[PDB]
Amino acid sequence: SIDPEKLRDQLLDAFENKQNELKSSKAYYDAERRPDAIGLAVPL
Amino acid sequence: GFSADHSQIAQTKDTMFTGYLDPVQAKDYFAEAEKTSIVQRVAQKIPMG
Amino acid sequence: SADHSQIAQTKDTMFTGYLDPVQAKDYFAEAEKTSIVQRVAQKIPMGATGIVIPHWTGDVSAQWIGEGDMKPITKGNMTKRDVHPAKIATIFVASAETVRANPANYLGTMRTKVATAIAMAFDNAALHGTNAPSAFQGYLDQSNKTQSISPNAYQGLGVSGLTKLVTDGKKWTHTLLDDTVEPVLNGSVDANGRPLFVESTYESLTTPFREGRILGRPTILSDHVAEGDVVGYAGDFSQIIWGQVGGLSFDVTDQATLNLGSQESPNFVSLWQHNLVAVRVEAEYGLLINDVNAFVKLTFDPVLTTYALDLDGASAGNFTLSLDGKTSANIAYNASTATVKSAIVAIDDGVSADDVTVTGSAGDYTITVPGTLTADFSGLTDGEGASISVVSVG
C-alpha cells in the first residue's frame, strides 16, 4: 500500500512528463509551426 | 570449564566443528526509516521542460 | 581501419574472395581436439562461492581390559578443505562487414576454436600445471614417482610401476597414454620374439589401443597427454574432482570500448567509432587432486628426477632424507651444500656421486636423484612450515 497524498504527486509528475512529448504529435494534426517545416531558400 | 579442544571431552567450542553450528542470519531490527525531501512537501510543484 | 592489424579482423590477405574453385573442405583438416581430464575425473556440482570438502581424522580407539578394570576414554576428530573456481577468458574482434559476410564461416570457426583452446587450457593446467591458476590444488606432473616403460611395457606398467605405487598404500585404477606410446606397446616381445597384447596373426589393433584393459584396469588414449619425457600416467583417478560453474558464455557488442595495448600503456578503441564488433568468451573451472602422489608418471628409459627442499626459514635442529624407504642420518638445517650429496650417497643403495647432484645453500637446496625422494622434518626444532616439492620441465 502507498499513501494517496504521495501517490497523487508522484502521478502528476508522470503525467506532465508525458505532456511534454505529446506536444510533438499535436503539432502535426493542428498543423502548428515546426522548425523543420520552414523552406530554407526564402530570405529570413 | 575446559580448554578449547580438551582432549577427553568434545564440546561445541572444539575447532573440529567450525563451519557446522554457525549463528543464523537475521533482519536488521535497527534500520532507519528511509527519509525524504521536506521542500517537495511545502513548495508548489510546477511542470518544466 | 589499419588493414591486417594484429587484433582486428577485416577484409585483408586472409581471404581469397569466395570464387567457385574454393573447395568445400580443407581436405587436410585435422579433427578438433578435446579435454581428457573432463572424461576421467569425477565431475562435482559447483557454484560461484566454491565448496568445502569435509574429512575424518580421529584415532578412535578401544582397549582390552580385565574383569572390573575401569574403561578408557577416546576421541573422534574432523577437518575440512575449501575449493574455489577460476575464470578463463578471451575476446576476439572483427569489422562489422566481416561479421556481415562471415567469410569462410570465420565467426563460427572462431566460436569453436576458442572453446577448444579453453578445453585444452583446462587439460594442460591440470596435467602439466603449465600456467595453472592460483585456485587449482595440485597437478598430475607434480607427483613424486616415475616409472620408465620403453623396453617392455608389461614389466613396466604391471610389475615395476605397480610395485612403487602399492608400496605407499596407493592403488592402480586406470592408465592414461599418449598416442606416441603405440610403438612401445607394439613389439614389447617375449623372449621368442612374439609380441604381447595382440593375437596370433597380428591383423588386430593392439589390445590397450582398442581402449581395452591392462590387468583389469581400463586404458584411456589421448593425442596430447605427452610433454617433456612424460608419455602417460597410471594411478587412482578417483582422487581427482573437478567442477564448472557455467558453460562457455558468448557475449557480443559493437557499442563497447576496448584497449588494444597493455594496462599501463593503453590504446583505447571504441568499437562503435571504428564500427568493429567484439565477442567476449569466458568459463569458470575448479579442480582438486586429493594428493598428487597417487599417480606414477610414465616415461622412456633413462629418466632422472629433480626436487626442491624448503625449510621455510627454520633456524635450529636437523632434517633427514630417504630414497626408496631407506633412511639417511640427521642433517643440520644449515649444512654446507656438498653435505647433502654426501648424505644421499651414504644410503644403502647403488646411488653414487656421478649420478646424484645438488645446488643451493642452507635450507634452499635443489636435489637431483635417480628415484623416489622423501624428506622428514621431525628432528627440526622450528620446522613448522618445512616442505619438499617436485621441479618442472622448462
CA distance C48 to chain B (A): 18
CA distance A16 to chain B (A): 6
Q: Residue C235 is inside which H or E element, if any?
A: strand C230-235
Task: Please report residues of B whose CB lies closer than 8 A to that of A9.
Answer: 40, 45
What are the residues of chain B with a beta carbon less than 8 Å away from any beta carbon of chain C?
Answer: 7-8, 10, 16-17, 19
Which of the other chains make 3 or more beta carbon contacts under 8 angstroms with chain B?
A: A, C
Task: Please report residues of A whose CB lies closer than 8 A to that of B45.
Answer: 9, 12-13
Q: What is the CA radius of gyration of chain B?
A: 27
B47–A20: do the CB atoms touch at under 8 Å? yes
Q: Which residues pair with C327 in a beta bridge?
A: C322
Q: Which of C332, C334, C308 is nearest to C319 (CA)?
A: C332
Q: Which of C182, C223, C218 is nearest to C35 (CA)?
A: C223
**Contact of C239 with C170, CB cutoff 8 Å:** no
Instruction: Supply angle C-alpha C263, C266, C268, rounded to 5.
Output: 125
The Cα C319–Cα C379 span in angstroms is 6
- For C75, C151, C158, C167, the CA distances from C147, given in Å and listed in that order, are 40, 12, 11, 14
The residue of C77, C79, C81, C83 whose CB has the most chain B CBs within 10 angstroms, and thus the best one to mutate to test that interface, is C77
Q: In residues, how long is chain A?
A: 44
CA distance B40 to chain C (A): 38
Q: Which of C122, C49, C43 is nearest to C84 (CA)?
A: C49
A19–B45: do the CB atoms touch at under 8 Å? no
The Cα C257–Cα C309 span in angstroms is 48
Q: What is the CA radius of gyration of chain C?
A: 27
Q: What are the backbone angles phi and psi of residue C105, rounded to the nearest 5°?
A: 45, 45
Q: What is the DSSP letter of C125?
A: H
The Cα C175–Cα C190 span in angstroms is 22
Neighbours of C3 (CB within 10 A): 10
How many CA atoms lie less than 13 Å away from A14 in the CB half-sphere?
6
The Cα C290–Cα C44 span in angstroms is 14
Breaks (C-N over 2.5 A) in chain A follow: none
Task: Please report residues of B whose CB lies closer than 8 A to that of C80.
Answer: 19
Task: Please report residues of C whose CB lies closer than 8 A to that of B10.
Answer: 75-76
Task: Please report residues of A whose CB lies closer than 8 A to that of B34.
Answer: none
CA distance C290 to chain B (A): 20
Residue of B nearest to A5 (CA): B41
* SS3 label, residue C248: strand
Q: Residue A6 is inside which H or E element, if any?
A: helix A4-29
Q: What are the backbone angles phi and psi of residue C247, rounded to the nearest 5°?
A: -65, 170
Method used to obtain the model: cryo-EM
- For B22, C151, C235, C359, C373, the CA distances from C302, given in Å and listed in that order, are 55, 11, 21, 21, 17
Matching residue, cell 612401445: C184
Neighbours of C137 (CB within 10 A): 18
Which of the other chains make 3 or more beta carbon contacts under 8 angstroms with chain A?
A: B
The Cα C101–Cα C104 span in angstroms is 9
The Cα C235–Cα C142 span in angstroms is 13
Cα of first residue to Cα of last residue in chain A, in angstroms, is 58
C73–B10: do the CB atoms touch at under 8 Å? no
C295-299 and C276-289 strand pairing? unpaired
C73–B8: do the CB atoms touch at under 8 Å? yes
Pick from A9, A13, A20: CB nearest B49: A20
Cα of first residue to Cα of last residue in chain C, in angstroms, is 40
Indicate contact of C with A: 3+ CB pairs under 8 A.
Answer: no
**Contact of C223 with C234, CB cutoff 8 Å:** no
What are the residues of chain C with a beta carbon less than 8 Å away from any beta carbon of chain B?
Answer: 52, 73, 75-80
The residue of B7, B8, B16 whose CB has the most chain C CBs within 10 angstroms, and thus the best one to mutate to test that interface, is B16
Q: What is the DSSP letter of A35?
A: G
Resolution in A: 3.5
- For C16, C91, C274, C278, C368, the CA distances from C269, given in Å and listed in that order, are 28, 14, 8, 11, 51
Residue of A nearest to B47 (CA): A16
Residue of B nearest to C81 (CA): B19
H-helix segments, C68-105:
96-101
**Contact of C257 with C278, CB cutoff 8 Å:** no
**Contact of C174 with C217, CB cutoff 8 Å:** yes
B10–C75: do the CB atoms touch at under 8 Å? yes
| Residue C12 identity | D
**Contact of C260 with C1, CB cutoff 8 Å:** no
Q: Which three cell numbers stand for residue C93?
A: 574482434
Indicate contact of B with A: 3+ CB pairs under 8 A.
Answer: yes
